[PDB]
Symmetry: D2
Subunit: 417 residues, 4 copies
């Protein structure tokens, strides 16, 4: 009754091949869609109306493509996103995608002006083009300046050198974009999928976010329904491990931007359920390093705990997003509802599959234990309204023990009433 | 450090993925077969010769359009293109029926009888919903069509839900994602696909992935990034065949599309994680007291143990070659057969490389078996499958006529 | 360094076969011995002085064999055990449970004598009953009715001694608190060459089910007359621990033999080596995989806590428990980490000795007005006792498992913690 | 189906097909009668209690496969007489019985005279005492001389250095004895099981025979039934992987030598069925290196073959017993019936669990292929007569292709008619 749904029969299988044989097109997905959708802003997606429609449809991250358009053009894109968000809470992160050393018909002086404009306007993420080695990342971090230290740097792997030197690059980036457009020209088209699966693999091991990009629903630029290769490509990117999936032409210039967003939402939700966690969790667990970080250790005990009871959600209190990021690397079925006072952490955490941020805006309660419990209550009332939690559900609550500890090192099992 | 071998030897799937390597060149023969649909862009003998060089293994006749005369021309054109290389590549001919409620319409029967009279090897039966639909097709093919393989197209919800029953009476399956993506929500078709290929793999029966794989190459000379993903993943799901429709029937780049599926297939096949796959297919498989099965599995175990360049199998109907292929050996299955139709039809099985043997039987049967093996070894050396000092497994029968393939021997080159 | 010890090279092996091949006789076991030792009381072990040496050697449960000896004889045994235990009331206090092993016999499965013996055991406050010749779930129910209402906290461990009990095992286990593999009689009721199948089955299923299992009889038989056991006998003890047994037992070796203390010591030494050789990577995985989903917050906290302890090489899981249960649910995942169970119930501090790896600490301070002060205080008591006993070092990581609400019975909170 | 209905409840097959080890144990069934031929060999030490030719025939009947002569005691004339009574018992019944000489050790001047005596009287195996390094084994190989090139050297590991230098000793030995008696004095008694499971595991992976020895049924020296610890000890030695189990005082001086042999046979038969091949065979397989030995490649394919069809036997033609050894390391559930023209090979193969030798004495047919087939029919008639085989069984036949190749490199699947 509960168990027919969200591919639970396939999830119980004892081998991967039996998992595949048990996938069922009548097992409806239950869980909130968790792979986040990045939408490139362009003429088709600049109106505030259009941007609200694309938020109801699932966009979590707006991409600004600095290959086209002036600073004033993009400042207007930024303005319409922020006005769409605050004319409804679903935060939307803003991502600056550097022109990079691009020819059209190292770090340039233009990229550096663009990165400074980005800090000026408070962007949350930089998609850094043509990262070929760790010093390219530093060049970017420098450019951002001490004022842009909270901005995440997702490094775009677009050519052979970046693929070769990937471990070094991942070791200094917050995350990765598999930038398949340039990559499929710079290395042979038939080899991209190997590079994609590898980098998503290595990123899932590292606990850092990975983005699949470019041409996933290409044909919806002119048609209202995608091709079968495209829906496959979305589904497989999620099955591969990706934290984010992206739309470029489909939302920037095409005729069906909202439908494009909706379609990635639909494919993503089905594929999330078809994930074979039992094998996935076991492989992450075996390969990941023993840890003496109380937050890592609470994270994995909390995720384990969530699977044993089919927890509806893990509610985590986080300030920077790190605690939710460590839950998310284990790919819980349960929603990671991350309550934070940082509105920029709330936006950035959309880079991590499965994290649903709540922005909490009350002044601190005099007694810290009362504050913690007030934020947790926020978490639960929100999750009830938004359909995450039903009375009678179990939830795992992850929090800290004392204030300014830096550690979210307490886990509690709890029944929604 | 070629053939994705570091990643093949990972101790987990997660680590296999992390070790996939764009520099690790594939050197085995492409093993997943390429079905190309015939149409105005691919009909000419000159186009068909270009496709065969490119990798085409199975020519598809879409009877949703065109007269008996037009398909009879298509058939004669493929056969000429083939015989002009007698680099001999048998090419199967498959009749993809029109269909639509009757498992077969008035017209379908006429088409089926046309296809029997013109010697077609395969039928793709549209809108198969249940076992009785398969049986209708097989009655329509009547007595002279008993050797024709029936690959049921699953195109809607009933057919997915009644899948196991269709599979058990079909020779194989096509995941017909075009109609299926309309008959059920499009976001679900990867689930139906992954299921059916898994089940077909486990039952050892050939499965075809079809439709819109490289759709944009109909007008463009390079595919999208989704399309290369789709083909690579279909091979990773387990498909025996991948198909091309508009891309070769009407598009401006039929040859290039065949090429591109050739290139992707090869890379995906190297990325296969046999270690998990072989073990899972041997675990899930069932006990068998058929000597041909038993020999097949023992032979695939042996080939992995010694990184054999190939398994050479003497087969008359292709069965022993299919039973080898159901275990996805890394080693090429070189199938030596006197039956022209079996050399064509084994292209439904991943990794089977048919060699047609035309010599008059030797008086001494043990001499006839050995001459056919040497023919396999030489043709294998000639084509690049086998180097001196490779190891091959050989799979044959014990006695003339038994109808069984119960002997295997290990051999150097 | 640290990773040469407690067969950690062998524990990190990626296969069982590789684990076996990396077992190292030089790799010293440094954890606390965790399989509990049942000693049968008899003329060789009855004296207070003899019992003190046995407690010191490792005895955790004293077994009263009511197949012989009068009520008065056993009342002396009990008083003697309790005196010896009281003699050590910190570093050396060791709760010791008292278990009553019934005399037993189509037959009724509770002789008229057994009822008198069980009423004796309740009157005298025994913690455990080992119930002979359990054939079916109604036999267990008979025993629970015989113990009457004062006896509701006594644990019932059903002895499986013949073919029928083996065959109705699941029915028995479901209503018992645990099991004893009673190999003596069982080796007569079924061909002796089959007993290891029964033993290995029953331990497996009790591990699965989270319930205690005792391997019993002739484990070190020759030490009755010899000061050293045979090579088969040390193997039997090691393998029973590797099979998954929570307790290992001594009968003639302690009741009538000439080397009762040495037999306890020897079961202590083997058990310690064997525990270190357990292949937890496979065993933890198979246990959670086969354990069903659960909506019991204490269950869920428990498995989350063992996962966490494994990930960080936790020196201990400290669990406040009133009844032993939250301790028992940590134990059923076989944590390499010691389970230190702080409790106010003297009876539960004794009874958790049925559970591998649980070290009870009896807490006697009066409640604190502030209930969260009382929790912190009991947790500290565990940390110090652990440091005073070698369980715990500065800088070790521990998992603390507690309740949130002074009144429910749930240990639904886990915290990760440094010793300082 | 074609096989009986009883089939799948016998031989612990329900446990054998379980998906995990834990579930395998949980499905062991004391009513699953073992049907297969007991395959672990029984070594029985000859002494006053076991020197009668009567006694020895009963012991062979009970299951003894190897007679151990303990040169720590008794004169050469004493052992000559023992050797003589063993051989008369055999040839007053065909059951080969190997004869093994166990050196006094602490290489002495006395051991040298003993090994030369041993060559003179044609012994099949030497249990060499206190092997501490590979050189020790060479001294034994030397003492045997050129006239003893065929004798197997099974190296007794009796102290710490032997344990720690184990890999180099196993590298030059045909096999290993875990000599628990001295080992339990030289290292702490409570560590021997660690040495035993280690050494059996390394011998299982290395394809070489390993013997578990000493005090296995000790109390049967004076009692007609053994203790519960002793039965458990035999069972677990077989479950550990041992090829042979040994009896010392139980047969050499005790009052129940025939009962001791019988009880080891009974316990060994049960424990062989209770083996979890599914995991064992896969571990041996992904641990074992790749190979270019055709015989070895054929062995694993023939064993895999026999498991797929529940083959009743693997009939193998062998001249030295190597092809039978190589099948034996994969621990087939099917009996390995080894047909050989070498009487010394037939005796020595009792070192390998699961190998059942048949001595073939006919002269070679002029057409090898007829000789081969005739030998295979000898295996099949022999197998039938003793209850290995029945009409309707499948067997896997393993032979050579051309005579004198030195490789057994063909398998055939074959119905028994």
């Amino acid at each position: 009754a509960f168990f027919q749904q969200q591919q639970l029969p396939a999830a119980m299988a004892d081998t991967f091949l039996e998992h595949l044989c048990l996938l069922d097109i009548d097992s409806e997905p239950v869980a909130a869609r968790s792979t986040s959708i990045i939408a490139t802003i362009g003429p088709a997606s600049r109106s505030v109306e259009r941007l609200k429609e694309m938020i109801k449809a699932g966009m979590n991250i707006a991409r600004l493509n600095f290959s086209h358009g002036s600073h004033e053009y993009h400042a207007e894109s930024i303005a319409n996103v922020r006005e769409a968000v605050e004319s409804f809470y679903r935060p939307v992160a803003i991502a600056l995608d550097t022109k990079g050393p691009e020819i059209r018909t190292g770090l340039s002086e233009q990229d550096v002006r663009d990165l400074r404009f980005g800090v000026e306007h408070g962007v949350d993420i930089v998609f850094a083009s043509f990262v070929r080695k760790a010093s390219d990342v530093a060049a970017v971090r420098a450019a951002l300046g001490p004022e842009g230290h909270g901005i995440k740097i997702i490094s775009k792997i677009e050519n052979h050198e970046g693929v070769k030197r990937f471990d070094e690059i991942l070791e200094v980036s917050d995350g990765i974009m598999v930038a398949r457009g340039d990559l499929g020209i710079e290395i042979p088209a038939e080899k991209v999928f190997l590079a994609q699966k590898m980098m998503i693999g290595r990123c899932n091991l590292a606990g850092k976010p990975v983005v699949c990009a470019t041409q996933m629903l290409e044909s919806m630029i002119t048609k209202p329904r995608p091709t079968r290769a495209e829906t496959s490509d979305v589904a497989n990117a999620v099955l591969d491990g990706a934290d984010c999936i992206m739309l470029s032409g489909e939302t920037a210039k095409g005729n069906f931007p909202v439908e494009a967003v909706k379609m990635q939402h639909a494919i993503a939700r089905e594929a999330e359920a078809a994930v074979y966690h039992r094998q996935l969790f076991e492989e992450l667990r075996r390969a990941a390093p023993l840890s003496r970080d109380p937050t890592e250790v609470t994270a994995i005990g909390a995720v384990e705990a969530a699977f044993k009871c089919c927890a509806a959600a893990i509610i985590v209190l986080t300030t920077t997003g790190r605690s939710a990021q460590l839950l998310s690397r284990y790919r819980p079925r349960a929603a990671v509802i991350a309550v934070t006072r940082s509105a920029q952490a709330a936006r950035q955490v959309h880079l991590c599959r499965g994290v649903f941020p709540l922005l909490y805006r009350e002044p601190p309660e005099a007694i810290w234990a009362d504050d913690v419990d007030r934020r947790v209550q926020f978490g639960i009332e929100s999750g009830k309204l938004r359909g995450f939690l039903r009375v009678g559900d179990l939830v795992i609550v992850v929090t800290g023990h004392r204030p300014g500890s830096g550690y979210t090192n307490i886990m509690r099992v709890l029944s929604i009433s």
